[PDB]
Structure formats: structure tokens, C-alpha cells
Amino acid sequence: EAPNQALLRILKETEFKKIKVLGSGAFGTVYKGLWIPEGEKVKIPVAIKELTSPKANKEILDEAYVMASVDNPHVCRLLGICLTSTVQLIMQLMPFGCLLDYVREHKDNIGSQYLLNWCVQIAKGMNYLEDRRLVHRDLAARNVLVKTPQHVKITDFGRAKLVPIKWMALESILHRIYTHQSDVWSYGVTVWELMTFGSKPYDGIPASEISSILEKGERLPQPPICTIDVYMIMVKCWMIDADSRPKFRELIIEFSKMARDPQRYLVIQGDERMHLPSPTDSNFYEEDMDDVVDADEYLIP
């Protein structure tokens, strides 16, 4: 197919300061930092990921490849890599972390407008990966980051091509078949994760039982806040026949119509009165805030 002319930026170790830890576990760690390029007079808030062994470096450079090859407002792009003993990825900082923990910690202020807009945004990012012929293979609320409460982006590649059993389509569990339509099943589970404010899908059920459970016809239950309209979409993502599930372009359309009148599709007690932080809030944006630019506003030719 087409030649991948994406640029892989190699960033100097001496170009980024104020390194603090955000999260550690399984693979390695994710750090908070500030990237100050050349004599650019800019400070970019960044996230530095590291999984020394040749196996860890191969897996991280595989994600670097995929992340450098993507450019969408709802996909987390690579700013560059740092060639230290262990190769570390440098991406845009999403200060609020993963959506899974966000819906859990902020449920009392999460309204229908926010939830449906999140669904539209995830579908837009997922439809972009489909245009770029990329199958995510690991879509979940834990792999969707929060830049601002009104802006979310898809993250965690490396599993992406051209195991999370409870987020997987039946063909993937049984035959290891991964398609854009299997990412649609993962999208369905992700939506369920949001509508339940971070519930564990099939909680208590061991992963070895899931395959049989799905084959019998059992699916994730209807969340209390969900109307038949929203749940019908979720159910459609969990059909045996992959070609019967909605396409991501149909999911954008469906959720957009719904996001126009959110109270008609999601029933949350004390809705609209709820408010989350915005760039219009007081002290929304620690060091010299003078020359700080977000990565979304830092473009290179």
C-alpha cells in the first residue's frame, strides 16, 4: 500500500525537565514532565512512558511507529521518543488521566451531555483508525484519556495492528480474529463502562467462563441511567455476526442525534445542575505558566 512518510522525532534527554511520577504498574511507569525545545520559548506539558532488555525496546518502538502514524483530535499522538538506555515515549499530557477512574471519581458531577459527547468522540477516533486501516485490539475506558472533561483521546497502542477477554468479541476469544468490527464490540463494553460510572464488566465471573456465557446469549446488563435507545446500540455492538454490528461512522451519527437532546436518552438524578472543570474555570490550567503551550497548539512543519 501507500508509503508511511510519518516523521519520528528523536528528542534530547536534556530538553525535558520537572519529571514527576503519575502511575506505575505491570509494564513499568508513566511520568509527568515539561518539554522545552531548542530556543523555541515554549514549555509543553508531556507524558513520558517506559515499559533494559531488547524485548521491552522492540514492543515500545512498535507503539512509537503506530503513534507517529496517527493525527486525529480524538487519538493520542506521539511527540517523539527519547533514546535513553530504555526507550521512552513522549506524548501530550492528558492531566485528568484515564476515563475509567474519572467516571468513578466524578460520578456525582457527570451528566448526560458529557457521557454522550464522550461516546461521539471515542467513535470519531475509532472511525479515524478505521480510515487509517488500524485495528486497536485493546479499546476500553482505561485506554481513553481525559485532556479536559469535554475532550477525550484514545491511547495505548502496541496491541494495535493492520489478553482483555471481557472487552473482546467472540471471534477474537475463540479464533483470534481481530477486525474493525471486533473493535466495535470493545466500543460497546467501553460505553457500558461509562454508563455504569466505571463498573467491572462481568464482575466476579472468571475469564475462562466468558466465551460460554456469550455463546449462550448472555450480555452485559442494561445500566439504570440507560434508555432502551442507548442500550439497543450497546446490544447491537455485541451481535454474533460482526457485519451486523454498527460501523463507527454510524455510531458517531447515532450518538450525535442523542447528544442534541441528552435528557431524552440518559436519565440521571439532578442532571444539568452538574458541572465539571472547563478552560473558563478559575485556575483550571505549578511552575512558570508564562510560556506553556499545549501539544495540540505546538505544530512543526
Ligand X SMILES: CN1CCN(c2ccc(NC(=O)c3c(Nc4ccnc(N)n4)cc[nH]c3=O)cc2)CC1
Q: Which residues bind ligand X (CB under 6 A)?
A: 22-23, 30, 47, 49, 76, 91-95, 97, 145, 155-156
**CA–CA separation, 186 and 86 (whole Å):** 31
- Least distance from ligand X to the Cβ atom of residue 122, Å: 16
Kindly state the smallest distance separating residue 92's Cβ from ligand X, in Å: 6
> 28 phi and psi, to 5 degrees?
-175, -100
Choice among 108, 138, 183, 243 that is catalytic = 138
> Using CB atoms, what's the residue nearest to ligand X?
97
Smallest distance from ligand X to CB 156, Å: 4
Q: Which is nearer to ligand X, 77 or 257 (CB)?
A: 77
Q: Which is nearer to ligand X, 92 or 121 (CB)?
A: 92
Residue type, 139: L
Report the 3 state secondary structure along the chain. CCCCCCCCCECCHHHEEEEEEEEEECCEEEEEEEECCCCCCCEEEEEEEECCCHHHHHHHHHHHHHHHCCCCCCECCEEEEECCCCCEEEEECCCCCEHHHHHHHCHHHCCHHHHHHHHHHHHHHHHHHHHCCCECCCCCHHHEEEEECCEEEECCCCCCECCCHHHCCHHHHHHCCCCHHHHHHHHHHHHHHHHCCCCCCCCCCCHHHHHHHHHHCCCCCCCCCECHHHHHHHHHCCCCCHHHCCCHHHHHHHHHHHHCCHHHCECCCCCCCCCCCCCCCCCCCCCCCCCECCHHHCCCC
Burial of 13 (0-12, 13-18, 19+ CB in 10 A): exposed
Is 290 assigned a catalytic role? no
Work out how close the CB of 23 gets to ligand X at its nearest, in angstroms, rounded to a whole number: 5
Minimal distance, residue 140 CB to ligand X, in Å: 11
Kindly state the smallest distance separating residue 34's Cβ from ligand X, in Å: 13
Active site residues: 138
